[PDB]
Amino acid sequence: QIRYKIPEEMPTGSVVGNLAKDLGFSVQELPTRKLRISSEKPYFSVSSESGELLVSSRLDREQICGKKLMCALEFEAVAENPLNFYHLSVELEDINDHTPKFAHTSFELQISESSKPGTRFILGSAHDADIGTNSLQNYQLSPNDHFSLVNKEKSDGSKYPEMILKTALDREKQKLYHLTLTALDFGHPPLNSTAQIQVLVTDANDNPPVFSQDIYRVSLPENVYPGTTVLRVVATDQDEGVNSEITFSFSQFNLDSNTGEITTLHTLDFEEVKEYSLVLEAKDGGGMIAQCTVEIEVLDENDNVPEVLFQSLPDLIMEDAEPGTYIALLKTRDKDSGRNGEVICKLEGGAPFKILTSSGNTYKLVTDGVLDREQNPEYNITIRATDKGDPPLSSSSSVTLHIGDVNDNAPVFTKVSYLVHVAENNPPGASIAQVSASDPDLGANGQVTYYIIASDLEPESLWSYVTINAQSGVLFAQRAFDHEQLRSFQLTLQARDHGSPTLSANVSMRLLVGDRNDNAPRVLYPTLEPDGSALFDMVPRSAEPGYLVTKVVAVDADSGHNAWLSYHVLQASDPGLFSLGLRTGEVRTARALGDRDSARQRLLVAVRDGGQPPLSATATLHLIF
């Protein structure tokens, strides 16, 4: 056989070769035989006039042989007279008419952020229809620092390009990358194909949420109502998507997980917990955690009242207390602190007492002046302690001070001097008077007693005359008094209390003896014989009337009307002859003496007193001329 070589896609009417020269047929021997090309598809034709082969239909190697290495089409040539056939095999060369081309103009790839460097990712190979050197040969990527190109070629021609990661990705630096890949064949000339690849770095949870500061500081009062916004902390996560979600947690208050704010749930208190320390943990979906701390310094409010403590209680104190003695001991204490715990105390009232501070929160009560029980025996004193909060809280305490009795008052009698008259011949041991003294003191100091100390009488008979009841003050006569023996007497008495020492008071009392008509009248002159007769026989007969015969003198031991002596005439031998002085007692002659009258004259008189009833003393007078 014979072989010819032409390129594919050859235009029609092109000379493949003269068969007349290769088969040995003359230019005139040729038209005799009707040259006809025999083939399944009429790709060729023989113009009988020219005597050579010519291209007829379009010669598409990719549609006939395709990937076949050598395309050898065997057709026939028929010539008539004589009937003869010749088989001709033609081989066509591949033309680089099909440039390489990728399946998609653009396709995006999503690569994770935590992709390890050196990982190989497969890429779709472009489809180049030509075979041999005109086939796809070189894949080349844009020069950068993050990705690289690798060709993997086996002998079978199923070679493909893949992308090797050069450095680790980081979506926070550049979220996306756009590169151009070029496929190139080795033909004349070489023609290339471009394809864009866009890599979007998928987020990974490599950055944890971070707080603004390590330590925060907040101060709030202890009286905040439940629900006060204490503090809110905010964290920042460098990721995006779910890996950026931040949740807060604790690891009397309350924290919301999403908003991240901490608010109180119950009332605070300074006396139990002064400051709180809280630890907050922020976590994302992938367990990346970070913790911070917040210190809440609760402020001390003046909500507790200061207290006044009494330590020594003096129920009884002396009235003669010197100024400035330590009476009671007080302290002031407050649970709060600072100006809320500092307490200043004062006393309210006009009582003479002062507060003296010896040291911090230590005070003493002293007397400011001299005291007295009789004027003010009791005091209700009020003491006020106030702190230095704004506004302050105060505390009052009331003490009842009682004043004791000191023996500073002597018993006093109801009257300055006493005077008592007592009738004569009184029964002994009888009540004559009663004295009463008052002592304002209390207890034994107010127990009065009366005694006798001195008297103008003889000190030995002082007991025999009078005595005193020391408890009641009644005076008792120890003998029947005699107005004739003693007329009056002075006494001095003493009132004394039962204290230490005893205070005394002296009183003066005069006792008088009233005269009673207990003595009969006694005749002094003239003297009488046992019969009671006196004889005066020297009376002149020639005496003129009015002659002083004699005079009777009488006395009475009593005094006053009880001694008032009046002289009467009981009986007489001659009435009208004698005249008597009712007051003086002078017996005289009333008329002249007649001789008829008898020589012997008898008279009987009686001396009487003005008492009721009167006592009489009789006497007889014999008078002879």
Ligand X SMILES: *[C@H]1O[C@H](CO)[C@@H](O)[C@H](O)[C@@H]1O
Ligand Y SMILES: *[C@@H]1O[C@H](CO)[C@@H](O[C@@H]2O[C@H](CO)[C@@H](O)[C@H](O)[C@H]2NC(C)=O)[C@H](O)[C@H]1NC(C)=O
Ligand Z SMILES: *[C@@H]1O[C@H](CO[C@@H]2O[C@@H](C)[C@@H](O)[C@@H](O)[C@@H]2O)[C@@H](O[C@@H]2O[C@H](CO)[C@@H](O[C@@H]3O[C@H](CO[C@H]4O[C@H](CO)[C@@H](O)[C@H](O)[C@@H]4O)[C@@H](O)[C@H](O[C@H]4O[C@H](CO)[C@@H](O)[C@H](O)[C@@H]4O)[C@@H]3O)[C@H](O)[C@H]2NC(C)=O)[C@H](O)[C@H]1NC(C)=O
Ligand U SMILES: *[C@@H]1O[C@H](CO)[C@@H](O)[C@H](O)[C@H]1NC(C)=O
Ligand V SMILES: *[C@@H]1O[C@H](CO[C@@H]2O[C@@H](C)[C@@H](O)[C@@H](O)[C@@H]2O)[C@@H](O[C@@H]2O[C@H](CO)[C@@H](O)[C@H](O)[C@H]2NC(C)=O)[C@H](O)[C@H]1NC(C)=O
- Contacting positions for ligand U (CB under 6 A): 182, 192, 378-380, 400
x/- map, 44-73, a second copy, by CB under 8 A? ------------------------------
Round to whole Å and give the CA distance between 516 and 522: 16
Q: Could you say which of ligand Y, ligand X, ligand U, none residue 618 binds, taking C-beta under 5 to 8 angstroms by partner kind? A: ligand X
560 binds a second copy (CB under 8 A): yes
Task: Decide whether 27 or 453 has the Cβ nearer to ligand V.
Answer: 453
Name the nearest CA neighbour of 208 among 142, 270, 285, 115.
285
Tokens standing for residue 39: 């083939």
Q: Could you say which of Ca ion, a second copy, ligand Z, none residue 334 binds, taking C-beta under 5 to 8 angstroms by partner kind? A: Ca ion
506 binds ligand Y (CB under 6 A): yes
Round to whole Å and give the CA distance between 481 and 420: 13
Tell me how far, at minimum, the Cβ of 476 lies from ligand X, in Å. Answer: 9
Expressed in angstroms, the distance from the first to the final Cα of the chain is 259
Tokens standing for residue 455: 């008297």
Mapped onto helix, strand or coil, the DSSP state of residue 417 is strand
141 binds ligand Z (CB under 6 A): no
Residues 6 or more apart from 613 whose CB is under 8 A from it? none
Q: Of 182-201, which residues contact ligand Z (CB under 6 A)? A: 184, 189-192
Segment interacting with ligand X (CB under 6 A) among 77-85, 445-453, 462-470, 606-614: 606-614
Q: Of 445-484, which residues contact ligand X (CB under 6 A)? A: 474
Determine phi and psi for 468, rounding to 5 degrees. Answer: -130, 135
Q: Containing H/E element for 87?
A: strand 84-93
335 binds a second copy (CB under 8 A): no
488 binds ligand X (CB under 6 A): no
Task: Decide whether 474 or 505 has the Cβ nearer to ligand Y.
Answer: 505
Tokens standing for residue 489: 């007497």
x/- map, 581-600, a second copy, by CB under 8 A? --xxx---------------
Name the nearest CA neighbour of 518 among 567, 562, 565.
562
Q: What are the CA-CA distances from residue 563 to residues 138, 340, 521, 587, 609 (Å)?
A: 188, 100, 8, 21, 6
Q: Which residues are annotated as a binding site?
A: 8-9, 60, 62, 94-98, 113, 128, 130, 134, 170, 172, 185, 203-207, 222, 237, 239, 243, 269, 271, 284, 300, 302-304, 319, 334, 336, 340, 372, 374, 387, 405, 407-409, 424, 439, 441, 445, 482, 484, 497, 515-519, 556, 558, 562, 609
Residues 6 or more apart from 31 whose CB is under 8 A from it? 48, 49
Q: Of 506-535, which residues contact ligand V (CB under 6 A)? A: 506
Beta strands in 300-352 (DSSP E): 307-312, 316-318, 326-333, 343-348
Tell me how far, at minimum, the Cβ of 450 lies from ligand Y, in Å. Answer: 13
524 binds a second copy (CB under 8 A): yes
Q: Could you say which of ligand V, ligand Z, ligand Y, none residue 263 binds, taking C-beta under 5 to 8 angstroms by partner kind? A: none
Chain length of the chain? 625
Q: Containing H/E element for 231?
A: strand 229-232
- What is the residue type of 105? T
DSSP code per residue over 53-98 = EEE-S---HHHHTTT-SS-EEEEEEEETTTTEEEEEEEEEEPP--S
Q: Which residues are annotated as a binding site for Ca(2+)?
A: 8-9, 60, 62, 94-98, 113, 128, 130, 134, 170, 172, 185, 203-207, 222, 237, 239, 243, 269, 271, 284, 300, 302-304, 319, 334, 336, 340, 372, 374, 387, 405, 407-409, 424, 439, 441, 445, 482, 484, 497, 515-519, 556, 558, 562, 609
Number of residues located near ligand Y, criterion CB under 6 A: 4
Q: Could you say which of ligand Z, ligand Y, ligand X, none residue 268 binds, taking C-beta under 5 to 8 angstroms by partner kind? A: none
Tell me how far, at minimum, the Cβ of 404 lies from ligand V, in Å. Answer: 24
Task: Decide whether 55 or 513 has the Cβ nearer to ligand X.
Answer: 513
89 binds ligand X (CB under 6 A): no
Q: Could you say which of a second copy, Ca ion, ligand U, none residue 408 binds, taking C-beta under 5 to 8 angstroms by partner kind? A: Ca ion
Round to whole Å and give the CA distance between 583 and 568: 10
Residue pointed to by tokens 């006020």: 384
Tokens standing for residue 15: 């000379």
**Partners of 466 in the beta sheet?**
477
Residues 6 or more apart from 554 whose CB is under 8 A from it? 521, 522, 523, 524, 565, 567, 585, 607, 617
Count the Cβ atoms, other than its own, within 10 Å of residue 570. Answer: 12
Task: Decide whether 397 or 436 has the Cβ nearer to ligand X.
Answer: 436
The residues that touch a second copy, with contacts defined as CB under 8 A, are 419, 421, 487-488, 510, 512, 524-527, 538, 548, 551, 553-556, 559-561, 563-565, 583-585
